[PDB]
């Protein structure tokens, strides 16, 4: 648990280093209930893993093509060649049902741990689920677990938190200047005194609405000022 978030801070009582990435933190009291702390642990794992996917998508799609921009990459005009100008309703239907399966299976792993491990169609092999939020079994096709799980668990949480801050960076260094993360890094390395946080905060390059095949999306920045 040691080496806390600040040098002179006493850790809370419910943060004795059982969970990984535990730094005596929560200066807003949110983890003080245990049933709330397990759910907030699950949501930190969810935001961490989806944020790692977000970072490794945004800074790889401009590696493979630095023309399609990741902000408007959700527009049907910017989809690739076998999916260009697809009906987004059918795509949203695919995603809605295929995620309402998976997420409700994970949710019932939260609500009753151990009751959701079997393949329900093929009543055979289970998933060996050692602790909540870490199913494994078929989610470890390479078997990097069954070793020091605490070590890799701390590694996952630290890279995940860094990727959460990185992805909420990637959006805000794209709302202010309308430029991708490696492209904003190159814009900083061009002139590192007029292409910084100064004279870029205060403008919002996001348009107010974009017609996606008939729908207008409200499209807000996270600060005021266009």
């Amino acid at each position: 648990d040691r080496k806390l978030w600040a040098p002179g801070v006493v850790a809370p009582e419910y943060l004795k280093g059982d969970l990984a990435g535990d730094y005596g933190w929560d200066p807003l009291g949110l983890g003080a209930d245990p049933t709330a702390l397990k759910w907030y642990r699950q949501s930190e794992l969810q935001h961490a893993r989806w944020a790692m996917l977000g970072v490794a998508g945004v800074l790889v799609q401009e590696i493979v093509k630095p023309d399609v921009y990741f902000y408007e990459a959700g527009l049907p005009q910017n989809l690739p060649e076998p999916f260009t100008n697809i009906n987004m309703g059918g795509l949203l239907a695919w995603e809605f049902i295929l995620m309402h399966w998976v997420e409700v299976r994970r949710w019932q792993d939260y609500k009753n741990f151990g009751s959701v491990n079997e393949d329900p169609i093929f009543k055979g092999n289970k998933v060996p689920n050692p602790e909540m939020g870490y199913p494994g079994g078929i989610f470890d096709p390479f078997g990097f677990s069954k070793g020091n799980l605490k070590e890799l668990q701390t590694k996952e949480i630290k890279n995940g938190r860094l990727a959460m801050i990185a992805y909420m960076a990637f959006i805000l260094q794209a709302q202010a200047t309308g430029k991708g993360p490696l492209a904003a890094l190159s814009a900083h390395l061009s002139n590192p005194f007029g292409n910084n946080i100064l004279k870029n905060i205060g403008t919002c390059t996001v348009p107010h609405s974009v017609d996606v095949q008939g729908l207008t999306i409200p499209l807000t920045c996270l600060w005021p000022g266009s």
Partner: protein, 230 residues
């Protein structure tokens, strides 16, 4: 340890796997009362049987008469026996059978015997499950068929509302809507036809007129819940 509607869940205390089709699904607590659960079991059986007969009717009526449309099939049938003579015969012939079934529900050990052919009496059956003469040559296990009837019946209850909400949105019978979904799956869903965003709501247009003529006096056809649609 029976299978459930949601596998990790716990079924409610009033649902103990006794009845067929009991998969622990009653989240609103409607089957808590024991007296009311009998009425609800009877109405699930009757809704399910009418829905199975209706789904088979709409499908067979489409595969033998593709010209005429089942939502309009009560308008163009052109029977020789008049419009109201059909409704009078149906009224008396159904007000008989339904009061017989209702009196079976109220007092089960009351209504078995044929009143005009007194040598014929129905055997002491279970409520909702008459048998005897309604059921000749029953194949295999009666509890297994009693589960299969409720499963196919729940599927057909969902299928009839599927037929109605297809035929009010595309205006076509439920193979032609299936031919829409097989000719272009990505653009013939309900999420393709409709979406509501905070700032505008794109509902699908109606394919049912607000009235039909039908021999003088006109029948309003409410497009179910138009406006409340997505």
């Amino acid at each position: 340890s029976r299978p459930l509607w949601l596998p990790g869940s716990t079924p409610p205390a009033h649902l103990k796997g006794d009845l067929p089709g009991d998969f622990g699904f009653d989240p609103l607590g409607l089957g808590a009362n024991a007296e009311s659960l009998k009425w609800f079991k009877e109405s699930e059986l009757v809704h399910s049987r009418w829905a199975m007969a209706a789904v088979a009717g709409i499908l067979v009526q489409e595969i033998v008469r593709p010209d005429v449309f089942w939502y309009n099939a009560g308008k163009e049938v052109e029977s020789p026996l008049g419009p109201l003579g059909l409704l009078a015969v149906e009224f008396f012939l159904m007000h008989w059978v339904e009061v017989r079934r209702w009196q079976d529900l109220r007092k089960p050990g009351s209504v078995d015997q044929d009143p005009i052919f007194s040598q014929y009496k129905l055997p002491p059956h279970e409520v909702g499950y008459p048998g005897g003469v309604f059921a000749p040559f029953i194949p295999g296990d009666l509890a297994e068929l009693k589960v299969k009837e409720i499963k196919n019946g729940r599927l057909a209850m969902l299928a009839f509302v599927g037929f109605v909400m297809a035929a009010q949105v595309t205006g076509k019978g439920p193979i032609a809507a299936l031919q829409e979904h097989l000719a272009d799956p990505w653009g013939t869903t309900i999420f393709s036809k409709a979406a509501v965003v905070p700032g505008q709501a794109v509902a699908p247009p109606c394919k049912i007129p607000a009235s039909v003529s039908y021999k003088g006096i006109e029948i309003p056809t409410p497009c179910f819940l138009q406006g409340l649609w997505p």
